[PDB]
Amino acid sequence: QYSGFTLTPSAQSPRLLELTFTEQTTKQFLEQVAEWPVQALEYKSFLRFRVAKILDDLCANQLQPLLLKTLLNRAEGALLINAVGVDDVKQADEMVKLATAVAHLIGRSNFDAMSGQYYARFVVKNYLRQPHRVMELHNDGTYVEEITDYVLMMKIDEQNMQGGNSLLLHLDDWEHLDNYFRHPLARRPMRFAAPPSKDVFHPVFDVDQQGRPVMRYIDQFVQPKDFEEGVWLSELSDAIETSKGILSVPVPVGKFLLINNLFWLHGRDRFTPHPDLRRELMRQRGYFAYASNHYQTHQ
Amino acid sequence: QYSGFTLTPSAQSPRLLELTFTEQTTKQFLEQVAEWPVQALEYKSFLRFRVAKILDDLCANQLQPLLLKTLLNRAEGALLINAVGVDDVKQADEMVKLATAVAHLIGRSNFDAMSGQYYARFVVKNYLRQPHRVMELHNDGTYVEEITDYVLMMKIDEQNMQGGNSLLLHLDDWEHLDNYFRHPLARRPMRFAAPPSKDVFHPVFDVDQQGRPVMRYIDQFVQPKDFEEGVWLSELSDAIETSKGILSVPVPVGKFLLINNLFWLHGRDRFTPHPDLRRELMRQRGYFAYASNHYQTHQ
Amino acid sequence: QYSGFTLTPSAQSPRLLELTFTEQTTKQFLEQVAEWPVQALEYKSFLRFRVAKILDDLCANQLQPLLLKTLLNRAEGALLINAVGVDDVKQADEMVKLATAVAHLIGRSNFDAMSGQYYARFVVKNYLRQPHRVMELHNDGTYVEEITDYVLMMKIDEQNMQGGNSLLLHLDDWEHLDNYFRHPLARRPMRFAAPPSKDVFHPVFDVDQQGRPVMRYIDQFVQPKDFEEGVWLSELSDAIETSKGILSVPVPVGKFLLINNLFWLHGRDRFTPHPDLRRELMRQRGYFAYASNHYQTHQ
Amino acid sequence: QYSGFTLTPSAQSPRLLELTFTEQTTKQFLEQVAEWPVQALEYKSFLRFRVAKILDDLCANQLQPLLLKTLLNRAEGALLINAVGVDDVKQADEMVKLATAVAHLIGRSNFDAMSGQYYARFVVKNYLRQPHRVMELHNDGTYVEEITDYVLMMKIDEQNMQGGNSLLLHLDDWEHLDNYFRHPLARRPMRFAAPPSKDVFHPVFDVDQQGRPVMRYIDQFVQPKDFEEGVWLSELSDAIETSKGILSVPVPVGKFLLINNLFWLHGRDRFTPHPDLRRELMRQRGYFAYASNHYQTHQ
Ligand SMILES: [Fe+2]
Ligand SMILES: [Fe+2]
Ligand SMILES: [Fe+2]
Ligand SMILES: [Fe+2]
């Protein structure tokens, strides 16, 4: 199917939509945000929303409602986004501007401790960093009190990379969801703790506004207090990691996944080590914030 | 128009008054504060008020009421101050003593994290530090709970400097003030956050004791929570930065601006880079504290 | 006297039982936990309970009840544990897996600040570290609010070691217990403070669920507030250190002590310095967590 | 005038008593505390009280009541203490043991941030550290909530030292006490702040249990909030520093002053710089803790 972009279902799943900005939209966007380097976006957070406005305005204001419709739709909730003409590591700054503009049409990206900024870039080259190790499926933000509504993962560079696809699991594609959701431990608050902060307690499952399951789970930060919790969690982990509903999604340079962190889990497949390997990623995580017609008190 | 000093309106604005201590007052002041090095003022804060008393006493006690009258007068609220005979970088310590004496007749200067002292000196030579970048107009102290009532900015040294004037904007010279003040977002508490502390919430506009607008705004530390706040703030920023009411004030070596931080914004113009450039500044920020005839309870 | 292990009283005391896993159990255990390196146990705490399940399952589920029966039995409360075939420093990782599996059948091991992990390994070679100095008998965990129920001390390596036995004192072997327990200072809360955290207050004696004495004492961290407390504590220290009930227990490589920290004190004897000396230890400390038939409210 | 020591008024003041332990008492003390190095006293605070008991026992238990009588006597409140045979820098450890024993008969010495121990030693050799600068009279402990009851200052070493006497001022020798005590600012809580912690508020004067003035004052840490407080404090400072009641007390190697910090101020005179100068000091500060016949509730 829009003004300034096209939208088509992915080859991995009808739940994941691919949104591509047209060449003209991309050139006009880059022109109109040229006066702010990424460093200005880092220092003045209102500029993150301003570049969002510029991009949405170039799409006849059709972009923001579509992003929101898609991310909040339980049947979908995931986008793979790119702009024609932004597809090489030399354009890293333009990539950051684009992902920033999209994210701040639907919410606000949170401070990232790994970078000290609202986004983090990191390069993979040359236990947790083992190429043969899958990064298991999980939700972000489980070790703080506030809810993380979205995860954004952008491929900045890729050289001599075999494997390393993003892994995704939509809870409604997870055949064994009801088995674990209906267990009493599904709704028991457990301790979550970050590595070097104060521990938080919340269950690994919750519900959305309609009573449907959502998840706040990661194997590294959950801290079972006893043998009962620990054995159950290892069984949950196994059931998630072996689910036949998992998607394996290549993320080419210049594209980014933008997913609803409440009912999508994400991870990363193993990849083959190689001396000339280079992979560069950028991430943002944040909360949704958007207008709706709803009730308020006083004047 | 005083005993020990003269006071005349600036060439940039009738709101900014220029106060010059006479040669005799300056020599007597330096004589009478010679027994305390700046290092004693740093270690014993009562001495900051004592050098204030000495300076005011040399002006027949006319200085303190005039400083207060001027700073608290909504129609003015800004002073450019100097002392005849203190005008060269070699006299940096005498400059610090003079600015200290003036500041502590009207209030108290707060701890400065950049220096670990009640004042900070810094040298500019050789993104935020780009000579071509204007430092946008703002208020100080927006990221703490307590109100900063005054900002003091002193030129200690200037060599091979082209440009770099202090910028000032009195809210009552700002033609578009009412447009932004009457918007609901003007009085919504927003998040303010310092870089490396705990976040504070306050609106960007408030009122003085008479209901007239005051401001607590800086583009770097305000953290709009969503697209609505962020777009509005970018529009406010633009309206402030393009105001025809902005003053451009040269601050020669040995002079200092002392302004009411509630209804003056301040900034700094771009300057031309030059290999032999040297600029040295000193700042103090603090709250007003002064006697008035007003009510009290008990005995 | 079991399926997969044998259990016999020690030569030092009928209160200390020696539990040895059979060669077959050990080989099957190591096979079935081979897919998780120690580093996976460090990163995913649910795996600590999973290796526990694997070991207990290989003992026909007789291991967990026996561990609990022994540790909670006031008449015993201490185990010396080993597995046939795990007895050389090269098998340090297998040792860590074994001690982890045992500990997490009965509870959960707490974060260790010395290592940043749920266990700590340290090597002794080449005032507190004086070989001629006895480490006095004490309880662990006295400087935090939560109770430490068990201490686990494993010998990873021993070369050219003369002396250095573990010292143990069961409160019911301590002839002078009643003398100190019946003193008013026994139940006065005193200050306990760790070295580089917030001070805690608790008495040096308490009672178990049956009203029998337990202890939370260490000479280094207790902080008598005055001459009365300090003199009494020095007398208590002397009475403990000279008790005829103290056990001196060699801990050969691959064996570990697992003791109930409420009514056993532990320490370490002096040893002879030697240029080629090498001793490697591993410790875990934690709380008990186990199922029992007891009352609950609501549904 | 005792068993094991002699007590005589100083040459500077009848308020300062000189207490000297006899040669025999000192030898027996050093013998009986030889089994604990200073390092054991650092690690086990109950040993600080135990060496106190040993010293008091060698004085037929006459020492502790006399120390307390003297320190709590408003007419005196200050001791200069030494032991015959302890008088050379090589005996620094014996000096520390002696001062520890005396201090912990009357109270408990607090943690010292400068050393990380209950006492601090520091060496002077080769603004605040200017030999020509007097350290002004003050009370210790003004920047924390708890009251510091005693200050202990011991001379460990002195070589090529001219000047540098301890300065002391007993509030009842201070002729202008009533002038400042009867001023409203005497009892206004002011802010006190340490350098690199949380600010405390208390007045500079208080009263003892009989309503007589005591002081909690230091010029460096008190933070007058305005011109009124700052000018008054500078006048108080001047009145204290120029008091004709100030004592100038030499502290020879091996002697220590032990003073009641509530109604004695202390300081240090200037000294002449010299290339071969060496001065070593040890300090302890703490609270009183002692038995009295007074009321209690419950049983
Ligand atoms: Fe993630
Ligand atoms: Fe500023
Ligand atoms: Fe221990
Ligand atoms: Fe002092």
PDB file of N, CA, C and O in Angstrom, chain C residues 127-128 136 191 217 219-220 222-227 230-231 233-234 237-238, chain D residues 37 39-40 43-46 48-50 52-53 64 104-105 107-108 287 289:
ATOM      1  N   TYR C 127      48.524  -7.960  58.269  1.00  0.00           N
ATOM      2  CA  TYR C 127      48.121  -8.465  59.580  1.00  0.00           C
ATOM      3  C   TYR C 127      47.109  -9.605  59.467  1.00  0.00           C
ATOM      4  O   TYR C 127      47.281 -10.660  60.087  1.00  0.00           O
ATOM      5  N   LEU C 128      46.039  -9.383  58.695  1.00  0.00           N
ATOM      6  CA  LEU C 128      45.012 -10.411  58.553  1.00  0.00           C
ATOM      7  C   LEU C 128      45.514 -11.607  57.757  1.00  0.00           C
ATOM      8  O   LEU C 128      45.046 -12.733  57.970  1.00  0.00           O
ATOM      9  N   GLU C 136      39.789 -16.166  63.658  1.00  0.00           N
ATOM     10  CA  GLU C 136      38.963 -16.544  64.801  1.00  0.00           C
ATOM     11  C   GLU C 136      37.577 -17.017  64.366  1.00  0.00           C
ATOM     12  O   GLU C 136      37.071 -16.645  63.305  1.00  0.00           O
ATOM     13  N   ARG C 191      26.072  -2.422  67.262  1.00  0.00           N
ATOM     14  CA  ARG C 191      26.361  -1.965  65.908  1.00  0.00           C
ATOM     15  C   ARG C 191      27.344  -2.903  65.217  1.00  0.00           C
ATOM     16  O   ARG C 191      28.367  -3.274  65.796  1.00  0.00           O
ATOM     17  N   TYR C 217      27.913 -13.366  65.252  1.00  0.00           N
ATOM     18  CA  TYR C 217      29.070 -12.755  65.890  1.00  0.00           C
ATOM     19  C   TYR C 217      30.295 -12.816  64.982  1.00  0.00           C
ATOM     20  O   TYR C 217      30.566 -13.841  64.343  1.00  0.00           O
ATOM     21  N   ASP C 219      34.408 -10.822  65.480  1.00  0.00           N
ATOM     22  CA  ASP C 219      35.121  -9.826  66.279  1.00  0.00           C
ATOM     23  C   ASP C 219      35.472  -8.572  65.478  1.00  0.00           C
ATOM     24  O   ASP C 219      35.515  -7.475  66.048  1.00  0.00           O
ATOM     25  N   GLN C 220      35.690  -8.706  64.166  1.00  0.00           N
ATOM     26  CA  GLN C 220      36.137  -7.587  63.330  1.00  0.00           C
ATOM     27  C   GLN C 220      35.041  -6.567  63.052  1.00  0.00           C
ATOM     28  O   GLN C 220      35.331  -5.377  62.906  1.00  0.00           O
ATOM     29  N   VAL C 222      31.853  -6.254  64.760  1.00  0.00           N
ATOM     30  CA  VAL C 222      31.072  -5.743  65.872  1.00  0.00           C
ATOM     31  C   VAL C 222      31.763  -4.508  66.440  1.00  0.00           C
ATOM     32  O   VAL C 222      32.997  -4.447  66.530  1.00  0.00           O
ATOM     33  N   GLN C 223      30.968  -3.500  66.792  1.00  0.00           N
ATOM     34  CA  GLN C 223      31.476  -2.182  67.176  1.00  0.00           C
ATOM     35  C   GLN C 223      30.907  -1.794  68.536  1.00  0.00           C
ATOM     36  O   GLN C 223      29.959  -0.994  68.631  1.00  0.00           O
ATOM     37  N   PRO C 224      31.461  -2.343  69.613  1.00  0.00           N
ATOM     38  CA  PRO C 224      30.992  -1.974  70.957  1.00  0.00           C
ATOM     39  C   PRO C 224      30.954  -0.464  71.119  1.00  0.00           C
ATOM     40  O   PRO C 224      31.868   0.238  70.690  1.00  0.00           O
ATOM     41  N   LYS C 225      29.871   0.041  71.711  1.00  0.00           N
ATOM     42  CA  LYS C 225      29.715   1.485  71.809  1.00  0.00           C
ATOM     43  C   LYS C 225      30.380   2.077  73.039  1.00  0.00           C
ATOM     44  O   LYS C 225      30.495   3.302  73.117  1.00  0.00           O
ATOM     45  N   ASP C 226      30.805   1.257  73.993  1.00  0.00           N
ATOM     46  CA  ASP C 226      31.361   1.782  75.236  1.00  0.00           C
ATOM     47  C   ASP C 226      32.153   0.691  75.953  1.00  0.00           C
ATOM     48  O   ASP C 226      32.235  -0.457  75.502  1.00  0.00           O
ATOM     49  N   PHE C 227      32.728   1.074  77.094  1.00  0.00           N
ATOM     50  CA  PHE C 227      33.632   0.205  77.854  1.00  0.00           C
ATOM     51  C   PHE C 227      32.926  -1.064  78.317  1.00  0.00           C
ATOM     52  O   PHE C 227      33.520  -2.151  78.327  1.00  0.00           O
ATOM     53  N   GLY C 230      32.558  -3.346  75.273  1.00  0.00           N
ATOM     54  CA  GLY C 230      33.839  -3.757  74.730  1.00  0.00           C
ATOM     55  C   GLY C 230      34.521  -4.790  75.599  1.00  0.00           C
ATOM     56  O   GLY C 230      35.061  -5.776  75.096  1.00  0.00           O
ATOM     57  N   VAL C 231      34.503  -4.581  76.919  1.00  0.00           N
ATOM     58  CA  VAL C 231      35.104  -5.564  77.819  1.00  0.00           C
ATOM     59  C   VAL C 231      34.354  -6.893  77.734  1.00  0.00           C
ATOM     60  O   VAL C 231      34.965  -7.958  77.611  1.00  0.00           O
ATOM     61  N   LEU C 233      32.672  -8.124  75.244  1.00  0.00           N
ATOM     62  CA  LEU C 233      32.964  -8.792  73.976  1.00  0.00           C
ATOM     63  C   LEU C 233      34.353  -9.432  73.987  1.00  0.00           C
ATOM     64  O   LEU C 233      34.553 -10.510  73.417  1.00  0.00           O
ATOM     65  N   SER C 234      35.336  -8.776  74.612  1.00  0.00           N
ATOM     66  CA  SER C 234      36.668  -9.375  74.647  1.00  0.00           C
ATOM     67  C   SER C 234      36.662 -10.660  75.459  1.00  0.00           C
ATOM     68  O   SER C 234      37.415 -11.592  75.158  1.00  0.00           O
ATOM     69  N   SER C 237      34.949 -13.292  73.222  1.00  0.00           N
ATOM     70  CA  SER C 237      35.938 -13.721  72.235  1.00  0.00           C
ATOM     71  C   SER C 237      36.888 -14.766  72.817  1.00  0.00           C
ATOM     72  O   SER C 237      37.103 -15.830  72.228  1.00  0.00           O
ATOM     73  N   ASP C 238      37.447 -14.470  73.990  1.00  0.00           N
ATOM     74  CA  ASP C 238      38.373 -15.383  74.651  1.00  0.00           C
ATOM     75  C   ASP C 238      37.713 -16.710  74.968  1.00  0.00           C
ATOM     76  O   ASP C 238      38.332 -17.767  74.798  1.00  0.00           O
TER      77      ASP C 238
ATOM     78  N   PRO D  37      49.307  -6.020  68.444  1.00  0.00           N
ATOM     79  CA  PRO D  37      49.836  -4.882  67.687  1.00  0.00           C
ATOM     80  C   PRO D  37      48.745  -3.850  67.459  1.00  0.00           C
ATOM     81  O   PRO D  37      47.549  -4.141  67.566  1.00  0.00           O
ATOM     82  N   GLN D  39      47.750  -2.900  64.823  1.00  0.00           N
ATOM     83  CA  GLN D  39      46.919  -3.395  63.730  1.00  0.00           C
ATOM     84  C   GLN D  39      45.752  -4.246  64.240  1.00  0.00           C
ATOM     85  O   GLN D  39      44.671  -4.238  63.642  1.00  0.00           O
ATOM     86  N   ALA D  40      45.941  -4.961  65.349  1.00  0.00           N
ATOM     87  CA  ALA D  40      44.831  -5.672  65.968  1.00  0.00           C
ATOM     88  C   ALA D  40      43.815  -4.700  66.571  1.00  0.00           C
ATOM     89  O   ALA D  40      42.609  -4.927  66.473  1.00  0.00           O
ATOM     90  N   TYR D  43      41.619  -3.486  63.791  1.00  0.00           N
ATOM     91  CA  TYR D  43      40.679  -4.439  63.212  1.00  0.00           C
ATOM     92  C   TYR D  43      39.587  -4.875  64.183  1.00  0.00           C
ATOM     93  O   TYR D  43      38.467  -5.158  63.748  1.00  0.00           O
ATOM     94  N   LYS D  44      39.876  -4.927  65.477  1.00  0.00           N
ATOM     95  CA  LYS D  44      38.925  -5.389  66.492  1.00  0.00           C
ATOM     96  C   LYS D  44      38.715  -4.287  67.531  1.00  0.00           C
ATOM     97  O   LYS D  44      39.484  -4.165  68.491  1.00  0.00           O
ATOM     98  N   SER D  45      37.657  -3.497  67.361  1.00  0.00           N
ATOM     99  CA  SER D  45      37.463  -2.365  68.252  1.00  0.00           C
ATOM    100  C   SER D  45      37.245  -2.775  69.708  1.00  0.00           C
ATOM    101  O   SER D  45      37.529  -1.964  70.600  1.00  0.00           O
ATOM    102  N   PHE D  46      36.790  -4.005  70.004  1.00  0.00           N
ATOM    103  CA  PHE D  46      36.694  -4.326  71.428  1.00  0.00           C
ATOM    104  C   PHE D  46      38.065  -4.292  72.100  1.00  0.00           C
ATOM    105  O   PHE D  46      38.139  -4.032  73.307  1.00  0.00           O
ATOM    106  N   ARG D  48      40.291  -2.035  71.802  1.00  0.00           N
ATOM    107  CA  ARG D  48      40.533  -0.673  72.274  1.00  0.00           C
ATOM    108  C   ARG D  48      40.070  -0.493  73.715  1.00  0.00           C
ATOM    109  O   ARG D  48      40.741   0.172  74.519  1.00  0.00           O
ATOM    110  N   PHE D  49      38.912  -1.060  74.058  1.00  0.00           N
ATOM    111  CA  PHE D  49      38.441  -1.007  75.437  1.00  0.00           C
ATOM    112  C   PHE D  49      39.250  -1.943  76.331  1.00  0.00           C
ATOM    113  O   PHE D  49      39.450  -1.646  77.515  1.00  0.00           O
ATOM    114  N   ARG D  50      39.720  -3.075  75.793  1.00  0.00           N
ATOM    115  CA  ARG D  50      40.482  -3.994  76.635  1.00  0.00           C
ATOM    116  C   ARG D  50      41.810  -3.389  77.085  1.00  0.00           C
ATOM    117  O   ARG D  50      42.198  -3.552  78.249  1.00  0.00           O
ATOM    118  N   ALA D  52      42.317  -0.301  77.499  1.00  0.00           N
ATOM    119  CA  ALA D  52      41.864   0.640  78.514  1.00  0.00           C
ATOM    120  C   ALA D  52      41.727  -0.033  79.881  1.00  0.00           C
ATOM    121  O   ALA D  52      42.224   0.480  80.890  1.00  0.00           O
ATOM    122  N   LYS D  53      41.032  -1.174  79.935  1.00  0.00           N
ATOM    123  CA  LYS D  53      40.874  -1.903  81.195  1.00  0.00           C
ATOM    124  C   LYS D  53      42.224  -2.241  81.825  1.00  0.00           C
ATOM    125  O   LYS D  53      42.401  -2.116  83.044  1.00  0.00           O
ATOM    126  N   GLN D  64      40.208   5.716  85.573  1.00  0.00           N
ATOM    127  CA  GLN D  64      38.942   6.024  84.904  1.00  0.00           C
ATOM    128  C   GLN D  64      38.098   7.061  85.640  1.00  0.00           C
ATOM    129  O   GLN D  64      37.673   8.034  85.000  1.00  0.00           O
ATOM    130  N   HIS D 104      39.492   5.184  75.507  1.00  0.00           N
ATOM    131  CA  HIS D 104      38.422   4.204  75.601  1.00  0.00           C
ATOM    132  C   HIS D 104      38.080   3.826  77.036  1.00  0.00           C
ATOM    133  O   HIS D 104      37.227   2.967  77.244  1.00  0.00           O
ATOM    134  N   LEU D 105      38.694   4.481  78.023  1.00  0.00           N
ATOM    135  CA  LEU D 105      38.171   4.467  79.384  1.00  0.00           C
ATOM    136  C   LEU D 105      37.041   5.475  79.570  1.00  0.00           C
ATOM    137  O   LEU D 105      36.255   5.343  80.507  1.00  0.00           O
ATOM    138  N   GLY D 107      35.161   6.864  76.699  1.00  0.00           N
ATOM    139  CA  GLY D 107      34.249   6.940  75.576  1.00  0.00           C
ATOM    140  C   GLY D 107      34.675   6.041  74.440  1.00  0.00           C
ATOM    141  O   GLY D 107      35.184   4.943  74.665  1.00  0.00           O
ATOM    142  N   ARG D 108      34.457   6.487  73.204  1.00  0.00           N
ATOM    143  CA  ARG D 108      34.852   5.711  72.037  1.00  0.00           C
ATOM    144  C   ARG D 108      35.260   6.685  70.953  1.00  0.00           C
ATOM    145  O   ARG D 108      34.553   7.670  70.723  1.00  0.00           O
ATOM    146  N   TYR D 287      33.025  10.396  71.410  1.00  0.00           N
ATOM    147  CA  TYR D 287      31.986  10.762  72.360  1.00  0.00           C
ATOM    148  C   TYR D 287      32.271  10.142  73.730  1.00  0.00           C
ATOM    149  O   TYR D 287      32.951   9.120  73.835  1.00  0.00           O
ATOM    150  N   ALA D 289      31.207   8.068  77.019  1.00  0.00           N
ATOM    151  CA  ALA D 289      30.290   6.995  77.387  1.00  0.00           C
ATOM    152  C   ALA D 289      30.762   6.450  78.719  1.00  0.00           C
ATOM    153  O   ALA D 289      31.895   5.972  78.805  1.00  0.00           O
TER     154      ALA D 289
END
